[PDB]
Amino acid sequence: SVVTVRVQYLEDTDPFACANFPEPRRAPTCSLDGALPLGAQIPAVHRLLGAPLKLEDCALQVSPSGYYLDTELSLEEQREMLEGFYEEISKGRKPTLILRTQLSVRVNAILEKLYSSSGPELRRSLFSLKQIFQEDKDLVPEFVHSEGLSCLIRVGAAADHNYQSYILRALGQLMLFVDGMLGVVAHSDTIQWLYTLCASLSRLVVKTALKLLLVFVEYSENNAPLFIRAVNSVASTTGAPPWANLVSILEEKNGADPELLVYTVTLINKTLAALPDQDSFYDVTDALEQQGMEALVQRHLGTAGTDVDLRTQLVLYENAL
Amino acid sequence: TKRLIHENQGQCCGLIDLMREYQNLKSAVSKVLENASSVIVTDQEDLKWAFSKHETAKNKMNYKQKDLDNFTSKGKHLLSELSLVKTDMESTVDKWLDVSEKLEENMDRLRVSLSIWD
């Protein structure tokens, strides 16, 4: 029960500098065994390839399919995940397999360099992180598994506004993918960090934190309570009243900023639309009526300089009550 | 048998047209880059104008930003092929990172400095 395939390796020991071409261009053939486990079979082909890959840090991706093989069960035992695979074989063609580094090992090298680098090194790395996630979404689950989020927060909270803004653009890259999204829904500390970020003096950083928080509340509604609880914990830990950061943006110490003001009102709006409970609702709206909200709303709805879109979403506010 | 000579020599051929390709692309790259550097610039109408002007500097910035990341995509899959060269690439990547951030927060200042006019 043997199998004849086309093999290629991928040099990805360093994830911040991955090469693009797998060598050789013309994949060589060798014969395996479909009913025996792959781990013991990896060395013959590893020497067949002469790869500069730590054989004990290696992993296997099915080329067209993308599947990561469990390295110590046979080919017949994971048949249910190789449907397209045996059909290429059944066509009488030879399917192709990519030798690369485990997502675990790659995310581990990443967490090292994030935790151990600094200055220009660290900065370069964060910029490339964005594109890396765009082009291998598969790293994202292993990433959530290795507390990479712990790393990101543990780095961002002691860094400057550029370092943090780059972190946040990267973070939006994570959240376009389902697994990273799930990691953010799980990590209360993360959303807490983004709320801290809404008090930054960088108005770019505030806009960005605000728009990603919009992405967060638009994905689902199950995370509206999680948001409100995180905000309460941050305001309570910092010594400030809950929600003070938004309303400070609303009553502008620096002046007018329509895009931020409209972003904020839509955010709170879209926080409002997701709860049938009127009682915690009333709890919260008292907490807000305390801080002075009605006069701010009133006097701003007065001035005709307000932009029309901002105005529409704030009348959605008033219409709610 | 004589073909394997033809083969290695084709390897040298393919690498020669390879970086001749890199060079012709880079031509346009240089023009764009030059312009990037160029757009720089260290009354109340004036401050406002500046925020509205730096706003078009950046409307143009993100406009070119799409082929700019086409540039970052091309460079990464560029150094995939091919000691001396590496530093060169790093040098332009760091220089462009510094001016990427630099015009980012220079237009930000110009917006947020007619904010001191508004």
Side-chain angles (χ1 to χ4, degrees), chain A residues 1-53 55-252 254-281 283-288 290-292 295-317 319-321, chain B residues 10 14 28-29 36 50 57 75 87:
Chain A
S1 175
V2 305
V3 287
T4 285
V5 298
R6 279 276 175 65
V7 289
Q8 267 173 334
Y9 70 88
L10 214 54
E11 182 71 35
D12 53 349
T13 308
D14 183 319
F16 301 91
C18 292
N20 221 19
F21 314 105
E23 287 289 314
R25 199 211 71 207
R26 297 200 53 177
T29 79
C30 79
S31 307
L32 285 174
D33 189 320
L36 294 178
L38 296 150
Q41 296 188 21
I42 306 178
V45 54
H46 181 279
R47 271 183 304 278
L48 170 72
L49 281 164
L53 291 183
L55 168 49
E56 50 285 38
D57 304 323
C58 287
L60 278 161
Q61 209 197 7
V62 166
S63 175
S65 87
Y67 174 67
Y68 277 93
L69 301 166
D70 174 352
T71 195
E72 73 276 17
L73 79 167
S74 67
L75 285 165
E76 287 274 6
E77 294 183 319
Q78 50 193 348
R79 196 168 176 114
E80 77 285 7
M81 305 288 295
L82 315 173
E83 190 198 69
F85 172 83
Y86 284 115
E87 281 172 344
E88 300 169 50
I89 295 163
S90 88
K91 285 196 195 58
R93 286 147 177 189
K94 296 165 246 163
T96 72
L97 290 192
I98 309 288
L99 191 61
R100 68 188 309 191
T101 306
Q102 307 175 22
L103 292 172
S104 73
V105 174
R106 284 200 261 137
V107 159
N108 276 333
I110 285 158
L111 290 194
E112 170 268 327
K113 190 163 275 291
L114 304 200
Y115 282 152
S116 71
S117 85
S118 61
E121 294 308 0
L122 197 59
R123 194 185 50 165
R124 277 191 298 276
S125 296
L126 295 160
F127 169 68
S128 289
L129 202 62
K130 181 191 184 69
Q131 268 317 109
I132 289 188
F133 291 136
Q134 290 202 6
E135 281 280 293
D136 197 339
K137 64 181 89 78
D138 277 0
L139 284 169
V140 170
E142 184 88 43
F143 180 84
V144 166
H145 180 276
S146 307
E147 308 300 297
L149 286 195
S150 283
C151 172
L152 282 189
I153 303 303
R154 167 143 180 115
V155 162
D160 83 14
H161 52 283
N162 304 321
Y163 282 68
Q164 304 185 308
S165 88
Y166 301 133
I167 280 160
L168 290 168
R169 295 169 221 188
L171 206 164
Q173 195 49 64
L174 282 54
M175 291 166 67
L176 284 197
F177 301 118
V178 187
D179 306 288
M181 193 63 197
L182 291 167
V184 170
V185 184
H187 202 167
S188 59
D189 286 82
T190 294
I191 295 90
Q192 286 174 34
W193 184 58
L194 289 95
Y195 175 74
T196 287
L197 269 285
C198 302
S200 173
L201 304 189
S202 178
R203 190 260 177 176
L204 173 53
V205 162
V206 184
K207 189 173 153 223
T208 300
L210 272 286
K211 303 205 281 142
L212 270 300
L213 280 173
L214 286 197
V215 163
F216 188 64
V217 58
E218 286 195 75
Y219 170 92
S220 170
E221 294 68 26
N222 279 304
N223 42 6
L226 276 297
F227 183 114
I228 308 164
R229 298 194 294 113
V231 185
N232 310 137
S233 191
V234 180
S236 192
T237 43
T238 198
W243 303 92
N245 283 293
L246 270 59
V247 308
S248 199
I249 310 162
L250 276 299
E251 57 94 16
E252 70 277 348
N254 294 323
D257 194 9
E259 46 278 18
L260 271 69
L261 283 301
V262 57
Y263 283 144
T264 314
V265 61
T266 68
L267 173 46
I268 44 178
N269 281 335
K270 285 180 180 175
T271 311
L272 289 183
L275 73 163
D277 180 12
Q278 309 305 350
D279 309 68
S280 291
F281 189 103
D283 168 64
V284 174
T285 186
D286 288 334
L288 287 68
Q290 187 208 20
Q291 210 68 51
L296 284 63
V297 166
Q298 281 313 304
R299 57 174 199 249
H300 283 306
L301 263 172
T303 70
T306 297
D307 189 67
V308 73
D309 298 299
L310 171 61
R311 179 162 303 264
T312 67
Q313 283 69 4
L314 178 47
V315 300
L316 277 168
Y317 184 80
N319 283 319
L321 291 173
Chain B
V29 182
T87 62

